[PDB]
Each structure stands twice: as structure tokens, then as C-alpha cells.
Amino acid sequence: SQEFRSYTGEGNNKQNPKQGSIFTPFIRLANPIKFNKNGFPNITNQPSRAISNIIFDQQTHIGSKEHLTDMFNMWGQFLIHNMALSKPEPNSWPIKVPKCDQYFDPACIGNKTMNYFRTRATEVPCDVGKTVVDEDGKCYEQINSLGSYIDGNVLYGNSEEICKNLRSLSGGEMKMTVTDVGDLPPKNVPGVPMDNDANLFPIDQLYSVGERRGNENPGLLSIHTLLLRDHNRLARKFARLHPEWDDERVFQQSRSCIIEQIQKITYDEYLPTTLGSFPSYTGYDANVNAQVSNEFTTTAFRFGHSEVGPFMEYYSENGTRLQPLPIKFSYFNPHALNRGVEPLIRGLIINEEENIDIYMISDLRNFLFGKPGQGGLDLASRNLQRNRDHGIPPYNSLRRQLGLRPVQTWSDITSDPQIQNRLKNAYKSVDDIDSYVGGLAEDHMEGSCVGQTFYLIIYEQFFRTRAGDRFWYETPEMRMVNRECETTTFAEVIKRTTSNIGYVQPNVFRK
Ligand code: HEM
Ligand SMILES: *[C@@H]1O[C@H](CO)[C@@H](O)[C@H](O)[C@H]1NC(C)=O
Ligand SMILES: *[C@@H]1O[C@H](CO)[C@@H](O)[C@H](O)[C@H]1NC(C)=O
Ligand SMILES: *[C@@H]1O[C@H](CO)[C@@H](O)[C@H](O)[C@H]1NC(C)=O
Ligand SMILES: *[C@@H]1O[C@H](CO)[C@@H](O)[C@H](O)[C@@H]1O
Ligand SMILES: [Ca+2]
Ligand SMILES: [Cl-]
Ligand code: NA
């Protein structure tokens, strides 16, 4: 009776069963400032949408200075969906639109807003860890509505019941939609609630995968598809190798391989690209907590929104460039896979992404439901709100609490005058800068695509989600379990799972 991971994350740490499990408070690297959970946070800086217009506005293409690909940030978005979800409660703190905003209030009605709901929170002890006494006299911490471990929840769901509805229960395989253009994920699966944020298409047309927001964009769904194909491929092998294994055993052995495949790409390919390198595994530490930190998911790792390019490229088998799909048209759009995943994959690995800086494309920052005065969303604003919702300390306060030296003037953050000016325009002091905008404004660390601050927060998180993981693939007991897997590089998984994909570079995150 071999022991396999749970679907929720609990049981991973023997001494602290719930450690890292779903629906548990986030960790803090730095004390939060009072965020007044039950009301609005007391913010003296400019509102989120103002900071968005002043700092994040983008009018031209910059292009990744590190020469990274769209596939790189598709994995980043795929990676975070394995780790953290800040699920909101019906606790409304709307985003105020400045009067006369050309994108959300051209008629100059100064009461226009964008929907925002504060993250689920729970009362915590005031004399434990890094918290703060809220303005109502109690201490609160935000709740991670997802397992903190990299455990394939993106494919298999967050519980037994959801998992056994996504899988065929035959040969240990996952349900799939067989089509004229390869195998695609399933649809209309009972018990698998899928997100429809943009609400362009009816939910019965969305694909049913282990992660609610899997339909967010097609490039994300494509990654889901290939790892599902690779899963059913391994299940057929284990079925032939071990005919005595029932459906449950073939599935788990296949699930175990895919989890290892996800982990290996992250720590052998993704992180060395993000941070320039990464130390080698040093063994499981039962005293390390793998739980996600509030600053990691809220602040540091949200850099990807800066790097998303405006267009999604499509290429055919013979290498011809097809009509690019603009991001704004791809939000929760299953039609993007009508011609299979191969045309997307080709575009993702060849097309260079956007630079990680203060600028965010307008597909994300100025997305509209229709006319310029009725509805829409601003991802830059949502991030600022979330940081202020969670009580992320100011830029210089965070650095101090991370063991870094605080900045003294604007030039200490960057030499680019236009960045300096936009910071002067948005904030009157460096000690008023939001950690999110400050870390983005920093110069990239040597060999990295992020600044010193974000570098430190990201490095600190992924050290723990590896060291604190009892089922980490590099541990002796897990090399034994996964002795018949076929874990390779991401580029080779693509070839294994695609039809006539064409040329694929070894590192699909670069060039
Ligand atoms: C649409 C969105 C994306 C691309 C078209 C996109 C992309 C990324 C990348 C590439 C990331 C990291 C490398 C990344 C990180 C995180 N995102 Fe995320 N993202 C899109 C849309 C959203 C939306 C909407 C949210 C929630 C907005 C809000 O906070 O109100 C979002 C969140 C995050 C996030 C926080 C994780 C969490 O706890 O939910 C990241 C670390 N992304 N995105
Ligand atoms: C808001 O913060 C300012 C200082 O940042 C403080 O003077 C003021 O009293 C605070 N307001 C509330 C309602 O807490
Ligand atoms: C905002 O509230 C309603 C929105 O329907 C609007 O009629 C009203 O004029 C606005 N309030 C102002 C402008 O003070
Ligand atoms: C093959 O290449 C030609 C050349 O432009 C292109 O028009 C056609 O769509 C391609 N068809 C494929 C790859 O099936
Ligand atoms: C915070 O605390 C309770 C414990 O009583 C949790 O069950 C729940 O998540 C709430 O939001
Ligand atoms: Ca950018
Ligand atoms: Cl500098
Ligand atoms: Na997880």
C-alpha cells in the first residue's frame, strides 16, 4: 500500500498535518500594516486606478531585455496556479475611477467604479508570527484557497471527488475530448466548477480542468492539454508494464510522474531563467514550512503581468505566420483551440515576450466590456488594491524587513529618468512607494529578469516549497516510486505530446 500525496496538501508534514494544506493562512516575511479588514484600508497615497494611469500606462512595445518567450510567462502563470489563490469574499472595496477617466468615466461622472472584493481572511493570534493588530483590535491573515505544494492540483483538482470526476476511471487515464486536431481537455464535467470571469462564452463551452481559472487564456490551456496527453501516455505504458495494477494504481503512478515533471521544469529550467541559477536540492527538512508567503503571491511573483505581450501568435505546420490573436480577445475563449494546440505552441516558443518593468499592456490595464464608460477591469489596479488589501508594507519598509538597505532618493531605484519622473508624479516620497511598483522599477539583477527585491522574495519562497515538501521528486524514497517515469525537459515533453510541431529549441523559455 504505497503512500501517495493527498489532493489538499495536508499530511505532507507529519508533525503539522495541515501545514501547506488548502484554505490556510498565508505566511508573512514582513509585518503587515493595518489594512482594516472589515472596512477599507486607510490609504493616504493616490487610489489604485490613479497609480495605474500614472505609472503602468504603456503606449509602445519595449520587448524583454533578457529575450524571453511568451512560453516563459505561460509557465509562470501555470506555476502560480499550482501554489496560491487569493479567493475573495463578498467583502466589497470597489476600485474608484478618477473623474473623467477616458477608459472608465469619459462623461466625467465622479462615482464610477470597478468591481473589487477583498480576499478571504480569518482571525489569527496576535502573538504568533508576523501580523498586525487590525483597527478593530484583532489580528487577521489572508487565506490561501489552494494547496501550497507543487502537487499537480492544476490537473487533478483539490480533492478526491473533483479528481475522480476529471478522470476516466479506466486504465488510470484522464478524461479527454478527442477531436480532428488531437486530444483536448474534457468539457461539462459535473462537479468541476470552472471560472468564467470575462463571461464572453457560456460555461458549458469552457474546458473542465483541475484549476478554476484554467480557461484564463489559451496558452495556459495548451499547457494543461500537453500534460494531460503526457499523463495518458504514461498511463498506457504502466498499464502494459503492470497489467495487475488496477485503475487507481495506474493513475497514481501517472500522477506522480507528472508532478515530478512539473517540479523539474520549474527548478531546472524556469527558476534558473528567472534568477540566473538556483542551488541544488539539499534534502527534505521537516522543520521548513512550504506555505506560500503573502508577499510572494501578492507582490513579487505578480511581475508576470508586466511581461505579457499584447498578441498571441499562431503558426502552421509549414512555419507560416497566421493572424495573431490579441490578448483582449483570448480571455476565456475556447475557440482559440479550434485548430488544436500546436499553432499556439509554435507561437509561444518563438515569440518574444514583454519586458518586466513598470509598464503593463493595455489589453490587461484597460480591458473593457463594451463602451469606454460602462464596465471593465484593470489588472494593474487590481494588483495595487490587493497589495493594499493585504497590507503589504511600503517599498522601503519591505526592504528593511527583508534585510536590505532602504533607498534614499529616486535615482537609487533606477537611472531611467522617465521611471524617476513617473515615481515623483505618483508618490511624494520614496517611503510612500508601493512595494509592487517599487520592485518593478528596480534594475534587473545580473543574470535575472527581476530586481533585487523581487529576486529575494521569489528565491525565498521556492527554497521552502522544495525543502518543505516531503514528496519532492529528488528525495530517495521518491526516486524509487518514480523509477519508471520519463521526466525530461519541457521542449521534449512538447514533442512527445504534439503532432508535427516543427522545430523546437531545447530551452523554450529563451530567444
Ligand atoms: C490574464 C492574466 C495573465 C496573462 C494573460 C496573467 C499572467 C501572469 C503571469 C505570467 C504571472 C507570473 C509569472 C502571473 C502571476 C500572478 N497572477 Fe496573473 N495573469 C492574468 C490574470 C490574473 C488575475 C485577474 C489575477 C487576480 C487579480 C487580483 O489579484 O485581483 C491574477 C493573479 C496573479 C497572481 C496572484 C496569485 C493569487 O494569489 O491569486 C500571481 C502571482 N492574474 N500572472
Ligand atoms: C490613516 O493614516 C494616517 C497616517 O498614515 C493617520 O494619521 C490617520 O489617523 C489614519 N486614519 C485612520 C482612520 O486610521
Ligand atoms: C452616483 O450615483 C448615481 C449612480 O447611478 C448617480 O445618479 C449620481 O449622480 C452619482 N452621484 C454623484 C454624482 O454625486
Ligand atoms: C503551408 O504553407 C503555406 C505557405 O504560405 C500556407 O499558405 C498554408 O496555410 C500552410 N498549410 C499547412 C501548414 O497545412
Ligand atoms: C476564519 O477562521 C475560521 C476558523 O474558525 C475558518 O474556518 C474560516 O476560514 C474563517 O474564515
Ligand atoms: Ca512590462
Ligand atoms: Cl541604479
Ligand atoms: Na498545489
3-state SS of 173-233 is: CECCEEEECEEECCECCCCCCCCCCCCCCCHHHCECCCCHHHHCCHHHHHHHHHHHHHHHH
Q: Is 493 in the pocket of ligand 1 (CB under 6 A)?
A: no
- Ligand 5 atom at minimum distance from 122 CA: 1
Which protein residues have their CB within 5 A of the ion that is ligand 7?
Answer: 415
Alpha helices by DSSP H, listed for 468-510, are: 476-481, 490-497
Mutate to test the pocket of ligand 2, among 44, 133, 388 (most ligand atoms within 8 A of CB): 44
Please identify which residue in the block is written with the cell numbers 541544488.
Answer: 280
Pairing of strands 95-96, 182-184: unpaired
**Alpha-carbon span 398 to 307, nearest angstrom:** 23
Q: Among 465, 472, 439, 437, which residue's Cα sits nearest to residue 84?
A: 465
CB of 386 within 6 A of ligand 1: the answer is yes
The alpha carbon of 358 and the centre of ligand 6 are apart by a number of angstroms equal to: 6
Amino acid at 364: L
The closest alpha carbon to 155, from 256, 20, 272, belongs to 256
Radius of gyration of the chain (CA): 22
Contacts 24+ apart (CB under 8 A), 242-248: 245/172, 247/169, 247/170, 247/171, 247/172, 248/172
Burial class (CB in 10 A: 0-12, 13-18, 19+), 161: exposed
Q: Which neighbouring-strand residues pair with 352?
A: 69
What is the extent of the structural domain holding 360?
A: 1-511
Cα distances (Å, whole numbers) of residue 188 to 163, 193, 194, 205, 210: 14, 9, 9, 7, 13
Residue nearest atom 6 of ligand 3, based on CA coordinates: 111
Give the Cα separation of 475 and 466 in Å (integer). 10
Three-state SS at 123 = strand
Helices (H) and strands (E) in the chain, counts: 18, 11
- Indicate which ligand has the atom closest to the C-alpha of 223: 1
Residue in the block written with cell 473533483: 162
Distances from the Cα of 494 to the Cαs of 61, 80, 223, 227, 384, in angstroms? 29, 20, 9, 9, 36
Task: State the distance from the centre of ligand 2 to the C-alpha of 34, rounded, in angstroms.
Answer: 10
**Which letter, b or e, does each residue of 123-142 get, where b requires 16 or more Cβ atoms within 10 Å of its Cβ?**
eeeeeeeebbebeeeebbbb
- Write the burial class of residue 251 (CB in 10 Å: 0-12 exposed, 13-18 middle, 19+ buried): buried
Whether 126 and 133 have beta carbons less than 8 Å apart is answered as yes
Apex CA 61: angle with CA 60 and CA 65, to 5°?
135
Q: Whose CA is nearest to atom 2 of ligand 5?
A: 122
Residue ID of nearest Cα to ligand 5 atom 8: 122
Number of domains in the chain: 1
Q: Ligand 5: which residues within 6 Å by Cβ? A: 122-123, 143
Length of the chain equals 511
The residues near 475 (Cβ < 8 Å, ≥ 6 apart) are 283, 284
Q: Method of determination?
A: X-ray
Pick from 377, 318, 27, 40: nearest CA to 200: 377
| Cα(6) to centroid(ligand 8), Å | 10
What is the rounded distance in angstroms from the CA atom of residue 378 to the CA atom of residue 361? 10
Question: How far is residue 369 from each of residues 44, 111, 328, 333, measured CA to CA in Å?
Answer: 30, 18, 10, 14
Cα–Cα nearest to 102, from 376, 309, 360, 305? 376
